[PDB]
């Protein structure tokens, strides 16, 4: 009996932490729409419906959303997919030209400048010999004054060419399910109260993740997975201030956003089979784009996040909010893509409050850039096509991305400012539950049996 | 739980239980190891990495005593310095994760011992079938 032999057991359930590639999965309802008016349901496998979310019991794994993988892979996949959905579309190299711009026909005061500038310019037709004179509308944030007369140019025309987006492919997010390949499994920490780091006492394995719609937002991340009961803040280190603070709250706050300026698109033929979509007439009043929010619900959710933030900073602590301290445009405001057109909306109305230890609606004005340079590359800019009709959208605000100021010198108050930063903090708000492990079979173990000859 | 009494459920379900209970459910973790214009390269490298890992495991088994027996008693002894615990305690007391944490050092010498034992058994069987 004490003459112990060894035995190999193949298919032993045991894993290790690993970093491998992943597996796209989209629902077949987005596959029902023909010719991919959203990106890549052909470059992504159809999701098998209701897959195996088999529970695991008496199992303790340590999760870490901050040093997590697959959020880097999600960032790389979304960047490469955004690049791969532009190579069919039209380059706007001949549009870089001297623009004769004046103000739009409007009873403008001298104080408030016209946001829209009308611009006429030369443009090549389909025929190389004949050129045409054509006009369009642009925003202030897309033209600069090259240098009596007043003549402009586009902003990107001395750093990069621009690619006009195809009006076929829309940027609205379809939910992406991530799946592990063979020999790997995705452990989902199903704990209710879980701050992103440490042992999760109630995990469950899975083959495919939930629906992760890729939204693009800097502050006030949209349509994410809200928490179960409480309002959970998450940080890599709360005492550190260089790391952001991902706040995920329970009740989603309804936000209404609109551009009320009615637009008429206009097809201008750049060349043979080259269509450019400019802005024609402003049918109706010239108004300003804005995003509402409900005052009572926003004050209530700010009370909830104050009540939760006082846990990590002591009870008798004054907590106040401020707006963004500065920088580029798309980190001061909060930016998103409503209906296939980009909004950059001011957030000073949402973060002017202080909090002591004891039917209206907030409006906030936006601005609309027609060109974008997201992810801040060196040589790419996307022009966006103007869309018809008055445009509105309703969304569920899910979480914030806050940042503590570098407080020193013995202050009771600790202020918070919304900071966008990297886009990965969006995906880290949706990949805190999951991690990827590699199954290793063929464990070995001593027991009492000897192989006979 | 639901699988109490008739102790089985889906794959990695026995991973929390003790190794004695988990030993009766090994066919599915063996099963869920193989089956499951530039993204095709990612799909293909995932598939060939999966079959390369599975073929490496089947070749590691095939050079030992068992081709596909999935439980293999063999002829190498066990150094009691490695386990240094009560034998019947570990099958009612330890998970496979904790056991793999225990014998993390004592690895890769066992495999050479298995290869030496299998080659010795092969030359002994060759001699036995030779003199007959």
């Amino acid at each position, epitope marked *: 009996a004490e003459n112990l032999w060894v035995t190999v057991y193949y298919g032993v359930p045991v894993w290790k932490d690993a970093e491998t590639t992943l597996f796209c999965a989209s629902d077949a309802k987005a596959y029902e729409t023909e010719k991919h008016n959203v990106w890549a349901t052909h470059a992504c496998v159809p999701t098998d419906p209701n897959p195996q*979310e*088999i*529970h695991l019991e008496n199992v303790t794994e340590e999760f870490n959303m901050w040093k997590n993988n697959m959020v880097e892979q999600m960032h790389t996949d979304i960047i490469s997919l955004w690049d791969q959905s532009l190579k069919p579309c039209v380059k706007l190299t001949p549009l870089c030209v001297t623009l004769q711009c004046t103000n739009v026909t409007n009873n403008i005061t001298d104080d408030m400048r016209g946001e829209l500038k009308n611009c006429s310019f030369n443009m090549t037709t389909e025929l190389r010999d004949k050129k045409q004179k054509v006009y369009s509308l642009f925003y202030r944030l897309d033209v600069v004054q090259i240098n009596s007369n007043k003549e402009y140019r586009l902003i990107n025309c001395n750093t990069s060419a621009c690619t006009q987006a195809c009006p076929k492919v829309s940027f609205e997010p379809i939910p992406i399910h991530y799946c592990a390949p063979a020999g790997f499994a995705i452990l989902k920490c199903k704990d209710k109260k879980f701050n992103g780091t440490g042992p999760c006492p109630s995990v469950s394995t899975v083959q495919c993740t939930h629906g992760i719609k890729p939204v693009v937002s800097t502050q006030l991340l949209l349509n994410g997975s809200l928490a179960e009961e409480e309002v959970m803040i998450r940080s890599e280190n709360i005492t550190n201030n260089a790391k952001n603070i991902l706040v995920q709250f329970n009740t989603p706050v309804q936000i209404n956003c609109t551009r009320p300026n009615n637009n008429t698109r206009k097809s201008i033929r750049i060349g043979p089979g080259q269509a450019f979509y400019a802005t024609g007439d402003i049918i109706g009043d010239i108004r300003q784009a804005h995003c509402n929010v409900s005052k009572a619900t926003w004050n209530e959710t700010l009370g909830k996040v104050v009540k939760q933030l006082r846990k990590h900073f002591g009870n008798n602590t004054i907590i106040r909010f401020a707006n963004s301290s500065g920088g580029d445009l798309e980190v001061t405001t909060h930016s998103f893509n409503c209906g296939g057109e980009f909004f950059y909306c001011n957030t000073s109305g949402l973060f002017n409050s202080t909090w002591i230890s004891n039917n209206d609606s907030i409006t906030l004005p936006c601005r609309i850039k027609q060109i974008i340079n997201m992810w801040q590359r060196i040589g790419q800019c996307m022009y966006a096509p103007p869309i018809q009709g008055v445009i509105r959208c309703v969304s569920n605000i899910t979480g914030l991305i806050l940042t503590r100021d570098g407080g020193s010198t013995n202050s009771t108050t600790e202020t918070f400012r919304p900071g966008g930063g990297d886009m990965r903090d969006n995906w880290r708000s949706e990949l805190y539950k999951y991690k990827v492990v590699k199954i290793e079979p063929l464990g070995v173990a001593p027991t009492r049996c000897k192989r006979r000859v | 739980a*639901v699988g109490i009494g008739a102790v*089985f459920l889906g794959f990695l379900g026995a991973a929390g239980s003790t190794m004695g209970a988990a030993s009766m459910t090994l066919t*599915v973790q063996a099963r869920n190891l193989l089956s499951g214009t530039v993204w095709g390269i990612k799909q293909l490298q995932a598939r060939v990495l999966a079959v390369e890992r599975y073929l490496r495991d089947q070749q590691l088994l095939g050079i030992w005593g068992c081709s596909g027996k999935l439980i293999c008693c063999t002829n190498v002894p066990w150094n009691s310095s490695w386990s240094n615990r009560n034998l019947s305690e570990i099958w009612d007391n330890m998970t496979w994760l904790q056991w793999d944490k225990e014998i993390s050092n004592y690895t890769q010498i066992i495999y050479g011992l298995l290869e030496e034992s299998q080659n010795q058994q092969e030359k002994n069987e060759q001699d036995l079938l030779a003199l007959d």
Partner: antibody
Framework: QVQLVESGPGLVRPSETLSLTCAVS?????????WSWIRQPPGKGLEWIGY????????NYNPSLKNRVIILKDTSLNQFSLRLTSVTAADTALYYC??????????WGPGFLVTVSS | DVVMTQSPLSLSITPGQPASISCRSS???????????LSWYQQKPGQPPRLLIY???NWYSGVPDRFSGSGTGTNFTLKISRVEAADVGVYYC?????????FGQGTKVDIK
């Protein structure tokens, strides 16, 4: 949030092959669960027919059911079906599809009276 | 198979007064882990039953704490320390530790 709904006859002749089918929504079939059939003769107590599993368990029934019960799972349609060959009129009972989990049979089906009559 | 017995078989409840059901299983329901796979149900007519207590110390999600449960060996105990009009139905004690799964007879409860 799971929802189970039976479908099939409630009036069949004796000495025939009875078969129901319970549709499942709200969750997945291939979970840590036994998708089960449990019956109840009218005015009397419950009678557990059997189960099937979303993993790879072999289905195990009550031996009083005389090996005439084959529960077959349909993971491509999120369903699982009872069978009962060679029925009698004494097999008139409310039938129930349910789900054994870490708790005991949380979401049932509504349960439909199959009245076997000639 | 496992045999289940509930006592009493009928108890018309007095509102404001407790009631009790003693369950008697034929075999030991305590599994080797240390738990007990025993559940309580409540028959509503033509309905899927209402589920009071599983795994006697545990609680279903959707059950107020005006019930209680205990038990030793094979004698387990469901108790309702304050009955209501919502306690209509015929209860059940059902084991889950042994194949085949079995259920009980039940206690008749109506208005007194």
């Amino acid at each position: 949030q799971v929802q189970l709904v039976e479908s099939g006859p409630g009036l069949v002749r004796p000495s025939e092959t009875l078969s129901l089918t319970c549709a499942v929504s709200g969750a997945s079939i291939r979970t840590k669960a036994w998708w089960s059939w449990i019956r109840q003769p009218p005015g009397k107590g419950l009678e557990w027919i059997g189960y099937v599993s979303g993993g790879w368990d072999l289905p195990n029934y009550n031996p009083s059911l005389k090996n005439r019960v084959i529960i077959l799972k349909d993971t491509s349609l999120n369903q699982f079906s009872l069978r009962l060959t060679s029925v009698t009129a004494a097999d008139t009972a409310l039938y129930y599809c349910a789900r054994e989990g870490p708790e005991d049979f949380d979401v049932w089906g509504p349960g439909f009276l199959v009245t076997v009559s000639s | 198979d496992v045999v289940m017995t509930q006592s009493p078989l009928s108890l018309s409840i007095t509102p404001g007064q407790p009631a009790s059901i003693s369950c008697r299983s034929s075999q030991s329901l305590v599994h080797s882990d240390g738990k007990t796979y025993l559940s309580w149900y409540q028959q509503k007519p033509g309905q899927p039953p209402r589920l009071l207590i599983y795994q006697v110390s545990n609680w279903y999600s959707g059950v107020p704490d005006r019930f209680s449960g205990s038990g030793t060996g094979t004698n387990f105990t469901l108790k309702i320390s304050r009955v209501e009009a919502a306690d209509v139905g015929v209860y059940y004690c059902g084991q889950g530790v042994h194949l085949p799964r079995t259920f009980g007879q039940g206690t008749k409860v109506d208005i007194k």
